[PDB]
Amino acid sequence: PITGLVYDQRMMLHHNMWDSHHPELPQRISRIFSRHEELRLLSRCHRIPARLATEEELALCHSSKHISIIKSSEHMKPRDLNRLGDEYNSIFISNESYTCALLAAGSCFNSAQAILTGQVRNAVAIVRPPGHHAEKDTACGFCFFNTAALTARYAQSITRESLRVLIVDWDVHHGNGTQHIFEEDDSVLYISLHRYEDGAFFPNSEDANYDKVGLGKGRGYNVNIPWNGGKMGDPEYMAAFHHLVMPIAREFAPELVLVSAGFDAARGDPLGGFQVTPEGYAHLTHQLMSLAAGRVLIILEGGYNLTSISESMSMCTSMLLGDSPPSLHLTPLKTSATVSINNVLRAHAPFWSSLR
Name the binder of 269 from K ion, Zn ion, none, CB < 5-8 A by kind. Answer: none
- 21 known ligand binder: no
Backbone phi, psi, residue 320, to 5°: -55, -40
Dihedral sign of CA atoms 231, 282, 47, 58 in order: negative
User: Do 143 and 137 meet the contact criterion of CB atoms below 8 Å apart?
Assistant: no
Contact map string, positions 141 to 170, toward K ion, x by CB under 5 A = ----------------------------x-
Contact map string, positions 204 to 243, toward K ion, x by CB under 5 A = --------------x--xx---------------------
Closest contact distance (angstroms) between CB of 196 and Zn ion is 13
User: Do 320 and 289 meet the contact criterion of CB atoms below 8 Å apart?
Assistant: yes
Number of residues that bind K ion (CB under 5 A): 10
**Angle formed by the axes of helices 27-38 and 306-320, nearest 10°:** 50
- With a CB cutoff of 8 Å and minimum separation 6, the contacts of 237 are 170, 193, 265, 276, 280, 284
Q: Answer yes or no whether residue 301 interacts with K ion by CB under 5 A.
A: no
Given 15, 133, 283, 286, the catalytic residue: 133
Q: Restricting to residues 139-198, which ones interact with Zn ion according to CB under 5 A?
A: 171, 173
Q: Residue 277's CB: how many other CB atoms inside 10 A?
A: 21
| Alpha helices (H) along the chain | 27-38, 55-58, 64-72, 78-86, 97-116, 147-157, 176-181, 234-240, 246-252, 278-288, 306-320, 335-348
Nearer to K ion, 185 or 311 (CB): 185
Q: Restricting to residues 258-277, which ones interact with Zn ion according to CB under 5 A?
A: 262, 264
Enumerate the active-site residues: 133
Binding site for Zn ion (CB under 5 A): 171, 173, 262, 264, 302
Query: Which residues are known binding-site members?
Result: 171, 173, 264
Query: Which residues are known binding-site members for Zn(2+)?
Result: 171, 173, 264
Binding site for K ion (CB under 5 A): 169, 171, 182, 185, 190, 192, 194, 218, 221-222
